[PDB]
Amino acid sequence: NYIVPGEYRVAEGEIEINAGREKTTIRVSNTGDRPIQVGSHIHFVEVNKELLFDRAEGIGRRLNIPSGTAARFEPGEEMEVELTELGGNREVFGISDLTNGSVDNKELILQRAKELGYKGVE
Amino acid sequence: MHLNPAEKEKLQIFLASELALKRKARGLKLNYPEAVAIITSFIMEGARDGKTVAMLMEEGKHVLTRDDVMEGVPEMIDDIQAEATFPDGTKLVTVHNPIS
Amino acid sequence: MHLNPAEKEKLQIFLASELALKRKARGLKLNYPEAVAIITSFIMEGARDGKTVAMLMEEGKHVLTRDDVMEGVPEMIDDIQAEATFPDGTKLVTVHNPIS
Amino acid sequence: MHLNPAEKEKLQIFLASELALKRKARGLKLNYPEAVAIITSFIMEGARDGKTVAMLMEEGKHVLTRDDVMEGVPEMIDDIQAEATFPDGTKLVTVHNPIS
Amino acid sequence: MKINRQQYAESYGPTVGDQVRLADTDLWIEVEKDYTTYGDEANFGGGKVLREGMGENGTYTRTENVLDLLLTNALILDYTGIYKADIGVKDGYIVGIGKGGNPDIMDGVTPNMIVGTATEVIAAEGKIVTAGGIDTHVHFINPDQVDVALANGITTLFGGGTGPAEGSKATTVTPGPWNIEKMLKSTEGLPINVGILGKGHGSSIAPIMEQIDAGAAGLKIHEDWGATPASIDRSLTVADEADVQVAIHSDTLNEAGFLEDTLRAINGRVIHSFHVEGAGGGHAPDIMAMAGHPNVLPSSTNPTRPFTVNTIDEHLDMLMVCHHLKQNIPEDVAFADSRIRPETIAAEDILHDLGIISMMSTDALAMGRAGEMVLRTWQTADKMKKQRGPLAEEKNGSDNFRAKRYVSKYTINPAIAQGIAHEVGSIEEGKFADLVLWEPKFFGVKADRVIKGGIIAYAQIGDPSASIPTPQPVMGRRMYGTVGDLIHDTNITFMSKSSIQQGVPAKLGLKRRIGTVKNCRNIGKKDMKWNDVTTDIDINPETYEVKVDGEVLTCEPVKELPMAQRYFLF
Amino acid sequence: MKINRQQYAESYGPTVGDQVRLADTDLWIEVEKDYTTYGDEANFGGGKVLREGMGENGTYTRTENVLDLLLTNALILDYTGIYKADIGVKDGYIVGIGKGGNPDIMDGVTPNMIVGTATEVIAAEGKIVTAGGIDTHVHFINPDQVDVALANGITTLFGGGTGPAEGSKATTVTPGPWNIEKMLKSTEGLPINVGILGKGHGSSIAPIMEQIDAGAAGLKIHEDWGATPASIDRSLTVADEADVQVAIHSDTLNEAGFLEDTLRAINGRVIHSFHVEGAGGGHAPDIMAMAGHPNVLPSSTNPTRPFTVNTIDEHLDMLMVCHHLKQNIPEDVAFADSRIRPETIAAEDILHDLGIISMMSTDALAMGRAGEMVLRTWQTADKMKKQRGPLAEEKNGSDNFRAKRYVSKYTINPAIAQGIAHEVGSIEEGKFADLVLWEPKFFGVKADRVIKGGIIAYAQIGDPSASIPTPQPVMGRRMYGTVGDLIHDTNITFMSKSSIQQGVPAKLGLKRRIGTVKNCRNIGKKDMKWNDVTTDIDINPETYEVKVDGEVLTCEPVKELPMAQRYFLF
Ligand SMILES: [Au+]
Ligand SMILES: [Au+]
Ligand SMILES: [Au+]
Ligand SMILES: [Au+]
Ligand SMILES: [Au+]
Ligand SMILES: [Au+]
Ligand code: NI
Ligand code: NI
Ligand code: NI
Ligand code: NI
Ligand SMILES: [O-]
Ligand SMILES: [O-]
């Protein structure tokens, strides 16, 4: 019965994030000489050009990490990341201007990605 | 004197610290605002003495112990921050969990 | 610290009391505002110590005597009122004719 | 207490002087605002003691010497002026080049 | 992927089933539900969610469902529930409670809660959020009292006064058309909502009615102006016609009648009974019997809350000063002993816990403390848990039922009584955005940030000359909501329907938002949220013993309270 | 008759060839020319020159070439020169710089600088006079920050915020039409010039553009809102159409691109790069390379100025608090080490001295100090003299060239960047009369008197109850320029052309002077006074070593600074 003012008593268990959405694991490599850190909610295909990965696999997806956290890529670093599906209307506007509409238009997204030099358009 | 707005305000901290130190001297366990006032004034006076930010980051953690304060006070104070004029200008000092 | 408006104001009373106590220590007979500051700060510090309202009503009448103050000062002070945080919350203390 | 606006303000000077005197006591050479605060409070407390304007004009020049203060401080202070309540009312005291 | 509960609560504030301690009390509140979608929580900062194309929509203009302000991850404590949600604000009003973000990419976004280019963000994760306090018993005596009120989470002041005049020092009254006009113009510079009460005294209708037409928002009957059967009757007649509330401080001296005579003059009409216990004033010794009637809206003032060991000694001497009583006049001693009663003060604790007294209030600067209504409400709740145990209705070991009962006493219930609950008094959609953020460790003691009309008005914040806002000294300060013309947009002057219809605001050049007082006359005790109990309250004329349905109500004073010496410098 | 130079300077302030020490620094400025006629100097007082029929003309009405205000014997320090002159003010504007007096009897009187019946006098003999500081990186977080700024000689605040909301605590942004309107009304009560920046984020034009129409004076792109290629591009498109400035705090995390991607999105358009060194934010680790491009207007924020022994320890821990970083998360440690770099902080000292970084600013209350822009500019100048020696271009053993280079960083250059240099930023004829008087012993530390629109707004002055104004305590106080309606006449709200054309001031009831933002889009680095250097700046990705044209820029931290412990109580 020591009193900590305003303390929590959290209930038992765990919180599952992004429940019921498809998950995907891909390899990603920072081919640049400066660090890149990627947030939980950026449309993954639209991340920095010097990150190399299967760009098709990033379409309509984002990192499967707690909201507000990030994945860090040191210069030259290759690692696996897990992706989850975008929700809501599944539309993306702005960012890198690769989508600007439905995420379903994978052909057009990839064509823009290739022309602008985003690495890993296979 | 040419007191600016900050100088006016920070005199209050010194005053609160004096009040709190008197209360400690007569054997009272210190509360939240008293504890904060003591550590803050310590930091500002340390900067006036010409100590470094690094020294004050260390020392700030040994100004008050848990037997100096009321129940719950150590857990209420996450960090204490103060800006003062060091010999090389104004600098921010942060002391993390000052009361262990 | 999270000082509210009252806490800011009451620090002034403590300061005035310190000033007045220094003046007493060098042998001066105290005037009206000095006398009031001394008794008021006494009450507030007593509440901090955990004394009761009843104790402070008694003690407040023996903080200063007429040989401590200037001519006319005892008659100028009808009562002194102060609010402070006791262990059971804020309470009003009134000391009637504190200087006899 | 019935504090007027001036009384409120001048308490700050006393507080700054206390701060500065503590800093002197631990062996620090005093800066510009500290030096000014010390001499000013000296004058006001002298008036409270019942000294004359003429006495304070003399004494004010021997409160701090150049070995008490930082380089340049003596030359920064041309004069120090203060008003206080003497036994014969409010009077202005000016101390010229207080630190020689 | 899964996050453990401890780390989740640390990052986003607590979720369903988690409990939080209220300050240093023994009271625990539990999250009843959560509007979020796990994994799509809104948050702001470097590399966070609320960024363009992600959690912030970059397509829509302000008019297309976009918010002016989003409070993320708030733990709401309100009469409507204790739950977790984002709060959406637009045009100074709460427009959405639910889940904010971007429907482009997020599941479960409340349709009118889009974060767009126009959206400001306040992070409320780890904070408790309540409605602003509504203080319905204020004497306007010293303008300094406004910051005192704001610092303890009060956002609306109802009462009367013209400053430290004797009439104002004794009664919540702004007398007559001229004084009311002057104080309405004064209000233009006060950073808080205000409603003004006129003098509920006179034997003809017209002298009373002209105050309502002048801009008053209600009336006060006070024994000091003569709380006679005539004044009671005329005031209630005016009130029924004008649709405003009447407050009463009854005839302590029983001069023209006893309690039953006052009730006969009221004649079943709606009335707000001030400081119902009676230490603050009223029929000696049985005023508290008012709290049992269906037509009475009962409130306490704060200095008797709760019953502690210093209470009686403090009040006996307070009364002697306040009333200029003399120790050598036996009538004065008799008067004081008939008025300051440990029996009724003790019972008042219990009546609150049972929901028989519906409201708290300050009695600011006359016989009460401007910044202690919220503070003393929770101290009472805490004391009652320690002495009576958890309430029958409580589940899961939490104090949620008691917390709703008590939070209602200073938010929704005073709003309903005054006829202003359509604008303020609770966190609900369509209401004015008066919101208080609290760190749980300071809950009910010192407000973190006070939002008025969607803009921060008051905050505990540090050195203005520092590199960041958190360095010392951290103190309560007025924010931009109080500066320049913004003070007009973020605050409400509540006025009677007739004064509004007659164009008083234009006449006087009032620039503040004008609120309408309405629906005061067809309410009763049954309309007080979580505090609707009617019953036979008996007070023994010889012993002052209080009985509720044949049962004797007794309580003990306590030596110590939470939310006291751990927190305050003096 | 002849006066010796020492006595002349003591009576009238210094003249041609005389030198003055700046505070307690090693910097000396020299009077380059003097507009006076020796023997006809203007002065005021008992038995002095400016008296009717003598130095004051008694014939002419105000409209006939007579001044509202004369500042006598000013030593002006400005980008246009360091020289001695009388300054003449009329209708709140500087109308004459030269020689004031009475053409009846005096030689060399500037024709529009007549001292007549309408003329007020300020004695500036023995004072240094500069333009008011222009701070272009302000977070509006705490209204107390305004006095802090005034006390160190700042007269214009550009930035954004709604108070201590998280969005405002992180970014200089007032988001959307409603928030902008609220803060415009708030500004009516702030005794300083203000311009407000909107949120430079979105993927459609309209959500961004509606902020300019609402009253915003520019835009801020900030990584916290998503400093993506799309947001960068749309904001610059809006800016080119609306003729306002864009400020950028770029993507530190390199998430959507590296520095070269940001520059590609900028595509040669004009942009103001905030805290270009990078401790305050931006592409890790090479953001400072921005400072070499012709289309970039580079500024520093103040906490890295200059490089001292406590700097790194302070910043590492400041960042941990500011960004909520944890010691046990290796990614956080990596982030901090990539962001707080002694190599780039040291080089920043040198880049300033070479004129490669054009501007100073505070970053008030987010990561910078509201009252220390002017202070830290001179500390940098002083440190660079001690380490690099006098500049090649210096003559006569004075530091005049360096003083012009540095004074430009907080006066004229921010004014040019923001598009407001037609009103403020320098002591020139036809400009608004924002003037700061300094005692040379307090120069850059504590302003003596701050004049806004021709009226004193702020002063270091003594006891208000004393027989004269000089008795203790001498402290900074607001003067008559800040009281009543005069606050409207002596201050400027800067707004976009479209909001002005659309009548936003009338819509909102703004009574302040309205200034027009213009000519922001056809300027570049070459337009920055005394700081126009373009060059190839290279930052080593492995070692963070900074190279300017193949040469390695290295500097040492110092243990002590002037304008510090000699002056400040804390
Ligand atoms: Au009374
Ligand atoms: Au009373
Ligand atoms: Au009980
Ligand atoms: Au940060
Ligand atoms: Au920072
Ligand atoms: Au160097
Ligand atoms: Ni009453
Ligand atoms: Ni009352
Ligand atoms: Ni920034
Ligand atoms: Ni900033
Ligand atoms: O009352
Ligand atoms: O910044």
Short mmCIF file of C-alpha atoms and ligand atoms in Angstrom, two decimals, chain E residues 279-280 318-319 322-323 339 366-367, ligand 2:
data_model
loop_
_atom_site.label_atom_id
_atom_site.label_comp_id
_atom_site.label_asym_id
_atom_site.label_seq_id
_atom_site.Cartn_x
_atom_site.Cartn_y
_atom_site.Cartn_z
CA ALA E 279 -22.92 26.63 7.79
CA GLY E 280 -22.95 29.06 4.84
CA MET E 318 -14.56 32.30 10.62
CA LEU E 319 -18.19 33.10 11.49
CA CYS E 322 -17.42 37.22 8.89
CA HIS E 323 -20.44 38.28 11.00
CA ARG E 339 -25.40 27.76 12.95
CA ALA E 366 -17.53 35.26 0.98
CA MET E 367 -17.42 31.90 2.80
AU AU G 2 -19.52 33.34 6.82
#
